[PDB]
Write a protein that binds this ligand. Structure first.
Ligand SMILES: [Mn+2]
Ligand SMILES: [Mn+2]
Length: 162
């Protein structure tokens, strides 16, 4: 996974209209039409496009793309950094949402989802689920056989691979 290789993969990850959209903002900081912008403006374009890198993350990227000291970042490297950030942010969002999902499922707030809680939420979806079906989910997800799903087990059940 070389730079060019990473760059190829960053473009395949986005739709072309998204890429053109990203470049239209990036171009407003170029001016010289060189295809690059100052590393001092990278945080601003990234936030303009919905990303939220921390200052340490910004520092780390700049050090990664500015080894020759030109003080600029080109568009292709920009896309790589944007896809890195997108993936990190989206994963943060999913984790957050799963913790919310669990507090809701765990009706009595004991820190566990029991079969009663599990059946109540699945039946409320409107799907025609049977008690068999609920009990099958419980057994497959209950890794330590204590009859309930803790948060770790929940994460594993939901993310599936996990
Ligand atoms: Mn509970
Ligand atoms: Mn368990």
């Amino acid at each position: 996974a070389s730079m060019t290789d990473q760059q190829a993969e960053a473009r395949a990850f986005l739709s072309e209209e998204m890429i053109a959209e990203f470049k239209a903002a990036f171009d407003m900081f170029d001016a010289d039409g060189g295809g690059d912008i100052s590393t001092k403006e990278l945080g601003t374009v990234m936030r303009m496009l919905g990303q939220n890198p921390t200052k340490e993350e910004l520092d780390a990227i700049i050090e990664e793309v500015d080894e020759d000291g030109s003080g600029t970042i080109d568009f292709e490297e920009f896309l790589v950094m944007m896809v890195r950030q997108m993936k990190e942010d989206a994963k943060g969002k999913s984790e957050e949402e799963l913790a919310n999902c669990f507090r809701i499922f765990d009706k009595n707030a004991d820190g566990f989802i029991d079969i009663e809680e599990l059946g109540e939420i699945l039946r409320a979806t409107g799907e025609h689920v049977t008690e068999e079906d609920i009990e099958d989910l419980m057994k497959d997800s209950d890794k330590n056989n204590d009859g309930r799903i803790d948060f770790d087990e929940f994460l594993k059940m939901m993310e599936g691979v996990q």
